[PDB]
Amino acid sequence: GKRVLIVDDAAFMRMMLKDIITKAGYEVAGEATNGREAVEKYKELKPDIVTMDITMPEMNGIDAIKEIMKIDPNAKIIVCSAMGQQAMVIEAIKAGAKDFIVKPFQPSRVVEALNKVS
Ligand SMILES: [Mn+2]
Description:
It is classed as chemotaxis. It contains 5 helices and 5 strands.
């Protein structure tokens, strides 16, 4: 679909993403501030896509990807990374992420990835 669950501990970052995802025609299923919170809302919300930050408190993105992958082996997760987070990117993808997006955000590339993932 086009209902995106946004997860990032940085509010600024969520809002920005949120702005892009909308202008692009997607829909904001909801948000989450950590890995545990993510897994939860994945469960309630059942979104079509998840954008997942890597460095977060309580549970990291990888932790939470694994979890979700447990709940839903068909989950569609895109991981957001800072530059120089190349290894964890690899890891998240090995974990099950479909793609990755860098921060700060390049909208064209955000949209592209999202489109690909659908
Ligand atoms: Mn973070």
